[PDB]
């Protein structure tokens, strides 16, 4: 309870938590429903700077793709932790009863099978980030005492 | 930051200052013999040269473990001159010129540790 | 103090964290299925990793 977590003011996340009949998500909804500070932000960018200014006090709940882009393609002062709570999926559409659904669906599955969508994602999300990948090799937490502690 | 080479450059400033007093006392000993018992001034010179050569041996040893090989090259020729003193074991004009260069070399390299140390501490 | 903090609580970390990390160390011999989806996917792969 030390970190207050909030979501968008009017979005799909708030509607999902309002109809989530899960004990893990139910207790989270009643906590976010009654809170003295602002646990709902109208703009996703206003909630982003709120997390950067809270410094470990506001955990914003957003989608996976938007979280990975705002972490890599922006000054990386925040990071994504944990797996996805629910499961969704994007998709291109087509008017009801149109001849441009069959071949289009076959082209989407063909691109996803040939490893093309994974390449386009890794190019626009990682190969073009703002702060980049500084020290890609994750420095393991050295259990030994550092030198600066007794400097 | 705080590296092992940064700490090695800090111990040199305290130790190289003591090497400065040795080469200065050597010029005073040479000046006294030039003006003019005699064994006292020469025996005291033999007791002073041994620590001066042994202390510099640590300067070539500390930087060896500190991976600062760009500074070791500035001290290897100084240690090679000590080998000629131990291998052989007028002379007044020769020793005078062989001592003024020590004061200049031990001072120009002294300012390096005063600046190369800052090039690592504040560069965090 | 540090030796007392060591024996009190233990924090064992995994030697790896992703697939793009083990492809650079090459210290752990990793294996897959003989014939299936994983083998066919790793066969025709355009990404470098």
């Amino acid at each position: 309870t030390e970190i207050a977590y909030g979501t968008l003011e009017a979005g799909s996340t708030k509607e999902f938590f309002r109809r989530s009949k899960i004990a893990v998500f139910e207790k989270m909804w009643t906590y976010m429903k009654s809170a003295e500070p602002s646990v709902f932000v109208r703009t996703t960018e206003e909630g982003m700077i709120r997390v950067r200014k809270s410094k470990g006090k506001y955990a914003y709940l957003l989608e996976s793709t938007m979280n990975e882009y705002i972490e890599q393609r922006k000054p990386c002062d925040t990071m994504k932790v944990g797996g996805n709570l629910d499961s969704k999926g994007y998709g291109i559409a087509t008017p009801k009863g149109s001849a441009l659904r069959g071949p289009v669906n076959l082209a989407v599955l063909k691109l996803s099978e040939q490893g093309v969508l994974d390449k386009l994602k890794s190019k626009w999300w990682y190969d073009k980030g703002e702060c980049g990948s500084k020290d890609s090799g994750s420095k393991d937490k050295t259990s030994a005492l550092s030198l600066s502690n007794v400097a | 930051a705080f590296t092992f080479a940064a700490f090695c450059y800090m111990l040199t400033l305290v130790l190289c200052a003591s090497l400065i007093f040795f080469v200065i006392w050597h010029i005073i000993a040479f000046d006294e013999l030039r003006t003019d018992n005699i064994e006292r001034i020469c025996c005291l010179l033999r007791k002073l040269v041994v620590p001066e050569y042994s202390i510099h041996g640590l300067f070539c040893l500390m930087f060896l473990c500190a991976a600062e090989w760009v500074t070791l090259g500035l001290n290897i020729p100084l240690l090679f001159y000590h080998l000629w003193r131990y291998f052989h074991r007028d002379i007044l004009n020769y020793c005078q010129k062989e001592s003024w260069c020590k004061l200049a070399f031990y001072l120009l390299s002294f300012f390096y540790y005063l600046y190369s140390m800052v090039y690592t501490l504040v560069s965090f | 103090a540090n030796l007392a903090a060591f024996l009190t609580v233990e924090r064992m970390v995994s030697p790896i964290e992703s697939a793009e990390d083990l492809s650079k160390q090459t210290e752990i011999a990793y294996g897959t299925l003989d014939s299936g989806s994983t083998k066919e996917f790793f066969r025709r792969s355009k990404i470098a990793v």
Binding site: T142, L145 | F7, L11, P51 | -
Partner: peptide, 28 residues
Amino acid sequence: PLAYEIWMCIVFAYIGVSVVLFLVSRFS
């Protein structure tokens, strides 16, 4: 409990303190 960078700093600080004390006990 102590990183390898500190163990290398202790030995050279030990010898450094020793030679400094020897130099101080020499001018007298």
